[PDB]
Design a protein around this ligand. Structure first.
Ligand SMILES: Cc1cc2nc3c(=O)[nH]c(=O)nc-3n(C[C@H](O)[C@H](O)[C@H](O)COP(=O)(O)O)c2cc1C
Ligand SMILES: Cc1cc2nc3c(=O)[nH]c(=O)nc-3n(C[C@H](O)[C@H](O)[C@H](O)COP(=O)(O)O)c2cc1C
Lengths: 201, 196
């Protein structure tokens, strides 16, 4: 059971888009976030912050301001009205989701370099670390019976997130995580072989 | 299940036991279960099996480091101490390089949304890396993520004959831990979890 339990974890993780209306224990969120932070991070750094959007008027106003920017940006692009609203409808999950947690990059412990190349490299390294912390959260949720779906939208509206949530300039949003009990039971995924995604040299 | 992610430690000393290849393969299949934006495949894992190529790529990385850190004005002392921290990639039984590839990237005319898309693909690869280190661990195999290839991307592309838009996102040293470790027991998030 201990062997198996070890083997099962990451295969319970699906991108869940339809949530039942069962409230989420606060404690599972908190514990799952604690597990998430076992992900690796460069030494003497803390790249990841998780920003849990508990106040519904705050969640809501951030999402409306995002929606608004989306329509005007997609309109500049010359997309037709219907197509814009199709896209915008993709964001409805963040409105209805039982919980929402924004992962953010912060350059805590970042090394400082004089040149642009190594400064970008450093920010990249920090970016993949937050990426690792997000996977570890989705899996921590999934093993506590909780579904989730990573929505990348805040990445395209960093200034609006920062302004709305009153965060300093160097906090960088890396999406949004919708969290809830899935409306439909889902089994274990049976992953496929790596095939062309693994390259031998 | 409570176990899996807690077996994952950054391990820096491996035994001489060889690593069965089918575990590296199966573990990469599991890593790619990580989420990815729709109709994209941001991640490639590049396994350095050919020892001459590994030795040759690290050697050029070592040279680039020495030459750079000397530009910065570090003392020979401190330089040798820092570069010796890359010995692990020489010694590790296996080395896998995760790489970002813009496969299925949506196209934008402006730099702002272009960068956002690149950032989106970058975090997806990170998630896949975590998924790998866990997948390995749950098959009783240690690993360590080393960031260095991110700082020598041109060298890595040159040396591995990869195209210009393959971006290395470190290197994962893999082997059986020389000393076993206890499970992790994570501390609560405290100030890293912000409530709004
Ligand atoms: C992006 C990234 C780069 C890293 N680069 C290095 C490295 O160059 N050398 C090294 O020894 N460890 C490296 N690590 C491993 C971290 O040092 C390690 O995660 C940290 O010391 C905490 O250990 P833990 O993973 O055992 O929780 C890296 C981790 C990440 C996420
Ligand atoms: C960086 C990132 C951004 C994402 N953004 C979205 C999104 O805006 N909408 C969405 O439905 N799913 C999003 N996803 C989830 C993927 O669509 C999902 O992983 C894919 O449908 C199938 O994988 P899964 O069901 O195995 O997770 C995102 C994933 C990542 C890594």
């Amino acid at each position: 059971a201990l062997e198996l339990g070890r083997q099962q974890a990451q295969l319970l993780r699906r991108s869940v888009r339809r949530f039942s209306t069962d409230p989420v224990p606060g404690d599972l969120v908190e514990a799952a976030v604690a597990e998430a932070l076992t992900a690796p991070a460069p030494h003497h750094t803390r790249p990841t912050r998780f920003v849990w959007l508990q106040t519904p008027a705050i969640r809501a106003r951030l999402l409306d301001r995002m929606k608004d920017k989306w329509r005007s940006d997609l309109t500049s692009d010359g997309l037709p009205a219907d197509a814009i609203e199709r896209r915008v409808a993709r964001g409805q999950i963040l409105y209805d989701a039982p919980e929402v947690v924004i992962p953010m990059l912060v350059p805590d412990g970042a090394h400082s370099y004089p040149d642009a190349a190594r400064t970008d490299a450093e920010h990249t390294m920090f970016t993949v670390a937050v990426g690792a912390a997000v996977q570890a959260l989705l899996v921590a949720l999934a093993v506590r019976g909780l579904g989730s779906c990573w929505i990348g939208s805040t990445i395209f509206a960093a200034d609006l997130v920062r302004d709305e949530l009153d965060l300093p300039v160097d906090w960088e949003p890396l999406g949004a995580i919708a969290i809830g009990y899935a409306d439909e039971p889902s089994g274990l995924r049976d992953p496929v072989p790596a095939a062309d995604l693994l390259i031998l040299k």
